[model samples]
Target chain A: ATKAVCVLKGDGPVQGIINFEQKESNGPVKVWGSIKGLTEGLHGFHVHEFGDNTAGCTSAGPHFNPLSRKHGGPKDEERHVGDLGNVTADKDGVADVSIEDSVISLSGDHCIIGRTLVVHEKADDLGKGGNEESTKTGNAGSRLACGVIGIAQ
Target chain B: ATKAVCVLKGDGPVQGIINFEQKNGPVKVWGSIKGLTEGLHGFHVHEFGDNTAGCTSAGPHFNPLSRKHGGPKDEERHVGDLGNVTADKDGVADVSIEDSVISLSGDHCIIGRTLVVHEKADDLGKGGNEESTKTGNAGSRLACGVIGIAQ
Candidate 1:
């Protein structure tokens, strides 16, 4: 009854998208997994609102902005509640992405509770490294894949 | 090649939602076919705009100022944009649809074309011949399925 959900892997189907889940853990809720069915290289990943899961992923709505803050880096002056970083795949279109958020909780509060995961056609510049308004999340690109983080069992 | 795009068959994926489409023999245009994989019975079909598909089947979209249009056949005016229809299955779905719209020639346009379906559900209240607006067309919850530009 006190257990939490976890995400192991996700893959985009021919319909052009996929889903993922994240939940409470003993320590920090870390996104520690890899995505398959990609074209290789780099893909953008983020936390989104709603689990509509419609539109192949568009129905997830915008990125998680619980604090209603602008899109920035995890260490920026202003940041988005959904900024987790980016994933870089090998020539085989695969990547091992990992990150931890202490601010996130799996119990109830501060947890990924009912958020969704979304993959992009392009890459996220981490809102830094110079592009457009690095202060806000880079333009990123189109949504190529996605899924919602929820309890599996 | 000015033949109207013939709709061999178009049914509501859901019980009450009505999705319809008409082919323009003159303009040669068609509509967008959607709702695949996401869910069964989830597809895009054009509805009879005129309540009749004879005169170009432009339907209520062009009926200008016809507000107060009740949900179904009773309230007087006419059925609103969303008509009662169906989707078909549960998860994965299937659809066999077509349209006729020649591109660049400027015969007819698919723009401003209102493609609507349903989200809730429709019920014409047909148990005996006594009708009920339990559903507007079929009483489809109504969804703006997307109007396509003929290419």
Candidate 2:
């Protein structure tokens, strides 16, 4: 499988590193990472447009919406490739994250290098939670932290 | 010629983008930064690309020999030290530097390290202070970036 890695840091307490691997651009992707200093609960995690992190978590643009899909979970039919759903942090505020997704990949035009990975302050309702915000952002709170999907030399 | 880039960021709103090019002996550094502190921002290449614990995670200067702090033109200076780049009255800093010690290729390449711009001036160990010999007392980190390969 092809491999790429992203190391995340923040102005606050959120920090971690994530690894991505896939056999092909059309194959499934596996993502895993350990993030620390999150609140005890589910927090929204997704890829965003623009790897330019010049303004903390405020300027990574929006959810990577190349497909013009609505906000949804990893399994939804109408979902942005950026959507991978939420990750749960334990009582001590650390998240051990692992997700095997078919939508996101490390190769092809959908390649995520030079992009941004963002962690939200609240849970993603997976677009079915209701009303306007759900279809848009699942009402996920503000961006807690983010980083670039920096590739290795 | 070899080429590379670094997209910089910070705690506030500073935005910097640095481009590197080397045709031969010395590397030519250029960039467009929207803003920086209100001094001569201390610019240097740090040891690591890891910002997992903030820029401190990026570690100390890229000093392999553990030598004292010196100016970019000083023969006794660190390999990654490039001296200062002062911002305009509008806080805009456009990069332009020439250094023989830095490169975009070979073993000493800076592909995965951090580019730091300090909040204050780098006195280049000439301040006659103990800490000056170590860090040039560059003060707090303001805006910065991590370098990666381009072409």
Candidate 3:
């Protein structure tokens, strides 16, 4: 089992910290984090495919959907592995999120130790949106902040 | 003696590599990459080498000189600005460019920066848009990599 850590950064006031911990080889990955500098509402959050951020958050690529599934919430079995649902911020522009995802791991083909995490300006529609990009990106708006996942010994 | 390399990565339509060679003065960067539509694509060095959050945390261009974005031949431009790399019909891009503004040593050292490949043409600062001075409005990021010292 391995643990990972990442710090999100952006041009604006959006920022956050995320932590990942794995206890067993094929067990679920526990993800926890706190983010601030956002409006009072829901925002889309997901792990991107590329670990390179040379051009701000836009260079991070698309979601880490190895399973080639459609966009959906964390509970959807047919959703992209990177889809973890939305994070709602308080009126003070802050959010605290925690979840246990079965598709993501720190080992094997699903390992995300060297990928990207992104916070979007809009909420993810959970695949209910009737459009092509919806299934592709959940229609998440501009990327607010982004970070890389690194192994934490 | 100096050299650098970037291992390009992206989603389905993006994957490639970039290499840099420098022994004395001018640093020459040349490499073969793929996964892009046929046309011109923006390429430049980013301010950060950290890829832990993928390319999102790599920050803006490596503009240590505080100059505006311009072509590679322009006297005033970001140190990371290398202009555009063209892709063929097969979506493969081959690039080989040398510049005196970039170096492997001194304040221009790019050892710990990021190399980015953009999704659209950079417009080379010719487009009269507000983003031209900043990012050149090169569209989304198709691929990304971190420059590293090669032994």
iRMSD in angstroms, per model: 18.3, 4.9, 7.9
Give lDDT tens digits, candidate 3, residues A56-153.
67766778888887888889787888888788899889988787888888765776645678989998988888999888878888999986665443
Q: What's the lDDT for residue B70 in model 2?
A: 79
Q: Give Cα-based local distance difference scores for all models.
A: 0.40, 0.76, 0.77
User: Taking the true A–B contacts (Cα pairs closer than 8 Å), what share appears in each candidate?
Assistant: 0.00, 0.10, 0.01
Q: Best candidate per lDDT, number?
A: 3
Expressed as tens digits, the lDDT of each residue in B21-89 for candidate 1 is 343332322333334223222122232212112212423332223433332343432323222323334
- Candidates' DockQ values? 0.02, 0.13, 0.04
What's the true lDDT of residue B109 in model 2? Answer: 62
RMSD of each: 16.1, 7.4, 13.6
Collision count for each candidate, in order:
48, 0, 11
Model 1, span A1-153: residue lDDT tens? 122222322234311222223443434555556655566666666776543332345555777776887776555647676776577677656666666655444443344433556666777777764655554546667766654343222
- Docking class for candidate 1: incorrect
* Model 2 residue A15 distance off true place after TM-score fit, in angstroms: 1.7
Worst 10 residues of 1 chain B by lDDT: B1-10
CA lDDT, candidate 3, residue A125: 87
Q: What C-alpha lDDT, on a 0 to 100 scale, does residue A35 get in candidate 2?
A: 91
Best by TM-score: 2
